[PDB]
């Protein structure tokens, strides 16, 4: 799993953020370097192995206002090595960079069966 892009939370009740696995700590633990620079140990139950976030997924899109709202992924595009998500909010679509696209606790939990690492105790 080392080197794979993931979306993961670093707290049991937090949001899922994009990052990469950097080290297999063992016993279901992994060291994760988030795209924002935060690095910590994360349990496999908190890790989603999906990249990019699939189409029609409900996500949380961060505006640079410090505003945020739920949206639905409607497309992806890679521009100069950077991934962008087309997010639809009540019929309007806009492009968001990868670090602006996260998953709420409830949004990411709904992806654990298809993409979650585990184990799940």
């Amino acid at each position: 799993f080392v080197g794979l892009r993931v979306v993961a939370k670093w707290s049991s009740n937090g949001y899922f953020y994009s990052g990469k696995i950097t080290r297999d700590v063992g016993a279901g633990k992994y060291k994760l370097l988030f795209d924002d620079g935060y690095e910590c140990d994360v349990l496999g139950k908190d890790i989603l192995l999906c990249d990019p976030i699939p189409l029609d997924t409900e996500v949380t899109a961060l505006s640079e206002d410090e505003y945020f709202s739920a949206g639905v992924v409607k497309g992806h595009r890679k521009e100069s090595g950077e991934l962008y998500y087309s997010i639809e909010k009540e019929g309007q679509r806009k492009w968001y960079k990868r670090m602006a696209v996260i998953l709420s606790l409830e949004q990411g939990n709904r992806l654990r069966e298809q993409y979650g690492l585990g184990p799940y105790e």
């Binding site: 924002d36 620079g37 935060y38």
Partner: protein
């Protein structure tokens, strides 16, 4: 008791540019006064009503590109309080906020004399941020009346910035100002009052 995830200071300084940094100060003083001459006040802690209608600590977001956390904190404290120069010796902890935005919250704490604390209050009402970002300083009541809600539990039932409520309970515990069991009981009575109010 709600608790944010802690992060060491050196690890917080390694966070990338997508992380915002805030610095807030909990100023407090031993208080030998007695309310009505009967209720020992023990300590007085300064919080403030913010522009957005929530209670929080003095301070705010800081720019860490070219300055230490202490310089940024003293800049914001200069605008919101008009006094005080805090140092690295007053640094207490750093917590990652609950999101969804990436924010690390650095908490500072400094014990003053009651006269010094009052001088901060006097300086705050003449400050640049008074009537704009800061709507007024308030002292935290740390006593509980015989009805089990008057004072500290009622205060905890107000509307807080979630980070500030966690920081207040964290600091009161680790600074040995309130036993953890009493913090849990006060928070349970506050939550109870909030539950019954919505009925």
């Amino acid at each position: 008791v709600p608790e944010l995830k802690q992060i060491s200071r050196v690890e917080a300084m390694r966070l990338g540019p997508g992380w915002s940094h805030s610095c807030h100060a909990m100023l407090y003083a031993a208080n030998p006064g007695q309310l009505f001459g009967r209720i020992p006040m023990r300590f007085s802690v300064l919080m403030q009503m913010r522009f957005d209608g929530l209670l929080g600590f003095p301070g705010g977001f800081v720019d860490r590109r070219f300055w230490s956390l202490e310089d940024g904190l003293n800049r914001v404290l200069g605008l919101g309080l008009g006094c005080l120069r805090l140092t690295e010796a007053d640094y207490l902890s750093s917590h990652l906020t609950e999101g969804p935005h990436r924010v690390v919250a650095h908490l500072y704490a400094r014990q003053l004399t009651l006269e010094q604390l009052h001088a901060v209050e006097i300086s705050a009402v003449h400050s640049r941020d008074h009537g704009l970002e800061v709507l007024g300083l308030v002292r935290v009541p740390l006593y509980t009346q015989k009805d089990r809600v008057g004072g500290f539990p009622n205060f905890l039932s107000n509307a807080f910035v979630s980070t500030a409520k966690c920081q207040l309970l964290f600091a009161l515990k680790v600074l040995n100002m309130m036993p953890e069991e009493k913090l849990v009981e006060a928070l349970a009575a506050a939550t109870e009052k909030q539950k019954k109010a919505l009925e």
